[PDB]
Amino acid sequence: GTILIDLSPDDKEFQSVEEEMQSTVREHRDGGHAGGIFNRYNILKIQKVCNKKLWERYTHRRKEVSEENHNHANERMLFHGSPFVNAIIHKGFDERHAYIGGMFGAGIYFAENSSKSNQYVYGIGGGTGCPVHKDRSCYICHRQLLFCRVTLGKSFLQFSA
Amino acid sequence: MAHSPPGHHSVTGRPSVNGLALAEYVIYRGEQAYPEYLITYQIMRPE
Ligand SMILES: O=c1[nH]c(-c2ccc(-c3ccccn3)cc2)nc2ccccc12
Ligand SMILES: [Zn+2]
């Protein structure tokens, strides 16, 4: 039930998503080991992901959270990188998309920095890099990230190195 | 998947060392995220 609709680069919606991608790149403490060495991206395509059943699954849970938190979903737009992007857009997020070994326990992780999520496109630690060239800093192979609507509700604050 | 801390719906990882890093977040229910945009891109080699 998932359809992908291309956004035109002339569309304000394309432009605001591209700006969030580009403007949230940062340098990483690994010097580029996991995600590659770069300051910006070449955006090739931005598609809207349309799935009625998955959207209703999201809004159902969003209302449950909001009602538990004085009518405040605390909804954010955040990046997600994963080897399982295809599974996610067709079947939805679930426990098989969790980072079992993450710093905050086994859950599904999202980043404000697009470059943080870029470190996970080829797996934890960048895995072995792109499938064609085995290069975590490949400048040739096309990568994909998701820009996701996320309900945080009441969020537990961890101060962390 | 783990559970959210009791009385909470997510965890926020606030950076406490790298002053330039932004926050990271964890949810423990897949129903709390919807993949609105699929972005296809390359990283660019710095000049
Ligand atoms: O976008 C992110 N993806 C991931 C990530 C990590 C692991 C996996 C994964 C999922 C299933 C099996 C193996 N690995 C999927 C996504 N971790 C992050 C951690 C911090 C901030 C952002 C992310
Ligand atoms: Zn490659």
Numbering used by the authors:
A (entry chain A): 952 to 1112
B (entry chain H): 1115 to 1161
What did the paper state?
Two homologous tankyrases, TNKS1/ARTD5/PARP5a and TNKS2/ARTD6/PARP5b, catalyze a post-translational modification, poly-ADP-ribosylation, of target proteins. Tankyrases are enzymes (EC 2.4.2.30), which belong to a family of proteins known as human Diphtheria toxin-like ADP-ribosyltransferases. Tankyrases control β-catenin phosphorylation through regulation of the stability of destruction complex by ADP-ribosylating Axin and therefore inhibition of tankyrases offers an attractive strategy for treating cancers with increased Wnt-signaling. Tankyrase inhibitors interact with the NAD+ binding groove of the catalytic domain and they bind either to the nicotinamide subsite, the adenosine subsite or span across both sites.
In particular, increasing the size of the para-substituent improved the potency in compounds 29, 30, and 31, all characterized by an additional ring, as well as in compounds 32, 33, and 34, having a branched side chain. This increase in potency is caused by the hydrophobic interactions between the para-substituent and the side chain of Phe1035, Tyr1050 and Ile1075. The most potent compounds were those characterized by a substitution in the para-position of the C-ring. Structural analyses revealed that the para-substituent improves the potency through hydrophobic interactions with Pro1034 and Phe1035 residues in the binding pocket of TNKS2.
